[PDB]
Design a protein around this ligand. Structure first.
Ligand SMILES: [Mn+2]
Ligand SMILES: [Mn+2]
Length: 176
């Protein structure tokens, strides 16, 4: 498929392999669910980017469930922050809060409402990125400095334009 080929062209091997591991964790073939494959790669890369801005962040996303919950439990035991219902994506050691990262092909406010309604925790900070350079965060606290958020938004927009150059963006954006 063209979408699978794009995913292997634009993401680094480590990210692709982690994404395939996740797809198997919910029993999904990346050769069939190619838009989910690309979305999974994109979310992984954003989380790793977000974390590289420390030191400051602990990455939970990209780990197997056992190690992810091991990290979460160790953090909660050393900080007293309460355990989230659902696996978050990062832990911010400076603000001392868990962060759930969203990347959406829709309006940032719609996806923010969806994520907030799901997690149902006033403790887990939400930060939504779009492929159009838009962002929305809990209490409009964007956590990072503008340069770091700028590099995330540039990478996301670049992924979108590469898809578009291969006529893959319309499929990807209409998929959820
Ligand atoms: Mn996650
Ligand atoms: Mn997320």
């Amino acid at each position: 498929s063209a979408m699978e080929d794009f995913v292997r062209q634009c993401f680094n091997p480590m990210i692709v392999e982690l994404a395939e591991k996740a797809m198997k964790e919910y029993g999904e073939d990346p050769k069939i669910e190619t838009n989910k494959f690309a979305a999974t790669c994109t979310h992984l890369e954003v989380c790793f980017m977000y974390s590289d801005f420390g030191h400051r962040f602990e990455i939970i996303e990209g780990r197997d469930r056992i190690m992810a919950w091991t990290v979460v439990n160790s953090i909660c035991n050393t900080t007293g922050v309460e355990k989230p219902k659902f696996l978050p994506d990062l832990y911010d050691y400076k603000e001392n809060r868990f962060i759930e990262i969203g990347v959406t092909r829709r309006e940032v406010h719609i996806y923010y409402l969806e994520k907030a309604n799901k997690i149902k925790s006033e403790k887990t900070h939400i930060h939504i990125f779009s492929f159009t350079g838009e962002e929305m965060a809990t209490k409009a606290d964007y956590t990072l400095d503008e340069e770091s958020r700028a590099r995330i938004k540039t990478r996301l927009f670049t992924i979108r334009q590469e898809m578009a150059s291969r006529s893959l963006w319309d499929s990807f954006r209409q998929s959820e």
